Design a protein around this ligand. Structure first.
Ligand code: NAG
Ligand code: NAG
Ligand code: NAG
Ligand code: NAG
Ligand code: NAG
Ligand code: NAG
Ligand code: NAG
Ligand code: NAG
Ligand code: NAG
Ligand code: NAG
Lengths: 314, 211, 114
């Protein structure tokens, strides 16, 4: 009503002739808004208990300082998360049910669980295990014997620590790294700007401004001009809502995929090819981002092959 | 059975579909009461009062409004239909992977380690009963990555090495069932100079007392 | 200007309500609590955290406890994992759990003759 008529009572009374169109539009946008909170909950609220890491970070040479919360900052976000966050008329914007801090707390709980109890906390009570032994189990999961992990523990820890460092440097120097999240922000801003600019259109009326019509014309003449504006503005609003419903469906599908990855990549070890990164999946770590989630996938990739003669049997 | 019979919100997901569709039809029908700028919402009242040229002006207003109302309905149905299709595709996947087999996908077939599932029919939908295995009553044990014996490093073939404070055993991981460490449940790889945290213990060879 | 929302428990429980004035200061309105969502009147703000019942926004939820209260929502029970470098926890027992999952499959098939 306010978008179409502003505070004009003459317009409002004419708008009533169209029935419940405005009720339908308000309802559709409400449904979308509610869904956005559902999407977030499905992805991040997958842990019953809120876990915290120990004061003593002894993980057998494995360094998680870039993904764990940095206590020296008021936001209590990881170094990587800080980087991610710094890289991205009747109209109002509603706040999310969960704040950025609450989402960060969920992420921290998931990381603390994974690091100290592996995948056990995702299928019941958290069972503690030494990190090196957790990694040994994950090596078995990809068909590699556990002695390979233990014999090369220093090498493996170093390769891991180096790879994580590269992620931080890559993001900080790659303007297009977070294009997927930026595209969502840009599309929504563009849609609202279009909707507002449509209020400048005459749609065949003498003026786009209701106050200018009402101050010049008497009732019967004003009504003719107002009807033209109502028709155009109602059509503009219907166009906006339809596009939002279509975009909302796309985002929902993305959120459903993210929720699946949280369960199958973070809360367990996946055997699905290319589902949790390229190579043989070992484990994954979640990081929060503006209107989205970032997964860091750790995989095992074979190197330096040699040619041998083989036989099916001896 | 007792939960469903005492929980009004248990089947909200199916009820929501019914409610949304009923609401959409009620809205579509109520739009027939709108004038859309015409002298009347009733075509018979227009035709009984006005001659052809005058009636046509009034009728055109009703056609425009009613056509717009119908287009709105259909568009919303296409969008809702796509959502239901996605749900049906997921249900079909679960039927195959949860009911017709045992899944290794975490949280795909219930919380815990999936054992099996059973389908039940419902109004406009399907209900799955997921049976899972959930670990309980854990205990703290001391562990080691390997056992050193005769200068060799022994690793578990299937389980994990644990100690009750005085003796070392090997056990399956998801259920405490301690067994004597033997050459039949470990394998040897290299010496004891490499593995960090390796501990000293006897490894029993079943052939020893026989020979 | 702004929207007005009514926060209520079911009429099957109580006839008490709280009113949220969206996007406005509590000073412009004429148990008054200012939130990021707007001014909430009729709900008593408490320092206790509970599971979210009726969502308000920005971490704030309301519930009926008798009168209506407002609080910061809890994300779940706090717990510390027994994280160590030489100790493992192993289940000595188990339980068999049965849970229900409900999915929509189809809609009512309607037809409208244009
Ligand atoms: C962990 O990594 C950070 C960043 O490279 C480094 O400053 C810190 O000293 C490392 N911690 C240990 C124990 O090496
Ligand atoms: C194995 O032999 C092939 C010959 O087709 C050669 O291309 C390849 O480089 C060889 N692998 C190694 C390790 O030399
Ligand atoms: C194991 O030790 C930890 C110490 O952090 C304790 O919290 C936990 O209750 C212990 N497990 C058992 C079975 O007592
Ligand atoms: C560990 O198990 C062995 C074999 O049953 C038993 O003899 C020993 O007393 C146990 N140690 C403790 C501390 O219970
Ligand atoms: C476990 O931590 C202790 C220090 O608390 C250290 O002395 C010991 O060598 C560590 N063991 C392993 C296998 O890292
Ligand atoms: C294991 O035995 C060797 C000698 O065979 C000894 O040098 C080493 O220190 C012992 N380690 C432990 C933990 O007893
Ligand atoms: C309504 O109140 C009655 C008790 O008077 C209760 O048995 C029933 O379950 C309630 N219904 C709902 C939806 O809360
Ligand atoms: C309006 O609310 C804000 C936030 O609480 C406060 O800082 C500001 O002073 C209030 N304005 C008035 C006039 O009280
Ligand atoms: C909440 O805590 C603040 C102190 O931070 C106190 O001033 C206020 O009165 C408390 N309110 C309630 C309901 O406990
Ligand atoms: C395992 O738990 C069940 C109850 O869920 C109990 O009846 C049974 O005795 C327990 N087994 C042991 C060894 O404690």
């Amino acid at each position: 009503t306010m978008y179409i008529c502003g505070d004009s009572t003459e317009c409002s009374n004419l708008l009533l002739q169209y029935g419940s169109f405005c009720t339908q539009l308000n309802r559709a946008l409400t449904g979308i808004a509610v869904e956005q909170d559902k999407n977030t909950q499905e992805v991040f609220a997958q842990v019953k208990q809120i876990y915290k890491t120990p004061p003593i970070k002894d993980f057998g040479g494995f360094n998680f300082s870039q993904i764990l919360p940095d206590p020296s900052k008021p936001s209590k976000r990881s170094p990587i998360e800080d980087l991610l966050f710094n890289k991205v008329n009747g109209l109002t914007v509603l706040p999310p049910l969960l704040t950025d801090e609450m989402i960060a707390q969920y992420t921290s709980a998931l990381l603390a669980g994974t690091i100290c109890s592996g995948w056990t906390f995702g299928a019941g009570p958290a069972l503690q295990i030494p990190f090196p032994m957790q990694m040994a189990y994950r090596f078995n999961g990809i068909g590699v014997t556990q002695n390979v992990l233990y014999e090369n523990q220093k090498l493996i820890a170093n390769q891991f620590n180096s790879a994580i460092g590269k992620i931080q440097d890559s993001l900080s120097s790659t303007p297009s790294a977070l294009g997927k999240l930026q595209n969502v922000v840009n599309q929504n801003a563009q849609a609202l700007n279009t909707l507002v600019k449509q209020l400048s259109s005459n749609f065949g009326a003498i003026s786009s401004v209701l106050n200018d019509i009402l101050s010049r014309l008497d009732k019967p003449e004003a009504e003719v001009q107002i009807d033209r504006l109502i028709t155009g503005r109602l059509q503009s609003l219907q166009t906006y809502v339809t596009q939002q419903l279509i975009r909302a469906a796309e985002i929902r599908a993305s959120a459903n995929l993210a929720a699946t990855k949280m369960s199958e990549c973070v809360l367990g070890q996946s055997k699905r090819v290319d589902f949790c990164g390229k190579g043989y999946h070992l484990m994954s770590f979640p990081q929060s981002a503006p209107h989205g989630v970032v997964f860091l996938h750790v995989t095992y990739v074979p190197a330096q092959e040699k040619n041998f003669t083989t036989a099916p049997a001896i | 059975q007792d939960s469903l019979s005492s929980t009004p919100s248990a089947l909200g997901k199916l009820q929501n579909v019914v409610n949304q569709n009923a609401q959409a039809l009620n809205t579509l029908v109520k739009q027939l009461s709108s004038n859309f700028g015409a002298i009347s919402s009733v075509l018979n009242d227009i035709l009984s009062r006005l001659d052809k040229p005058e009636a046509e002006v009034q009728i055109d207003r009703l056609i425009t409004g009613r056509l717009q109302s119908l287009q709105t309905y259909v568009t919303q149905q296409l969008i809702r239909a796509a959502e239901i299709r996605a749900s049906a595709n997921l249900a079909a996947t679960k039927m195959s992977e949860c009911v017709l087999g045992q899944s290794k996908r975490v949280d795909f077939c219930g919380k815990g380690y999936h054992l099996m599932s059973f389908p039940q029919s419902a109004p406009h939908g399907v209900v799955f009963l997921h049976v899972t295995y959930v670990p309980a009553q854990e205990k703290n044990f001391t562990t080691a990555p390997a056992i050193c014996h005769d200068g060799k490093a022994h690793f578990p073939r299937e389980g994990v090495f644990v100690s009750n404070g005085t003796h070392w055993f090997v056990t399956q991981r998801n259920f405490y069932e301690p067994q004597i460490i033997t050459t039949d449940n470990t394998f040897v790889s290299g010496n004891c100079d490499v593995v960090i945290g390796i501990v000293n213990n006897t490894v029993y060879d079943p052939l020893q007392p026989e020979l | 200007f702004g929207g007005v929302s009514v926060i209520t428990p079911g009429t099957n429980t109580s006839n008490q309500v709280a009113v949220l004035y969206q996007g406005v200061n509590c000073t412009e309105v004429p148990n008054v609590f200012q939130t990021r969502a707007g001014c909430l009147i009729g709900a008593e703000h408490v320092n206790n955290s509970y599971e979210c019942d009726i969502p308000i926004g920005a971490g704030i939820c309301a519930s009926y406890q008798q009168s209506i209260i407002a609080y910061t929502m809890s994300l779940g029970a706090e717990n510390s994992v027994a994280c160590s470098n030489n100790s493992i926890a192993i289940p000595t027992n188990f339980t068999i759990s049965v849970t229900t999952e409900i999915l929509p499959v189809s809609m009512t098939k309607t037809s409208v003759d244009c």
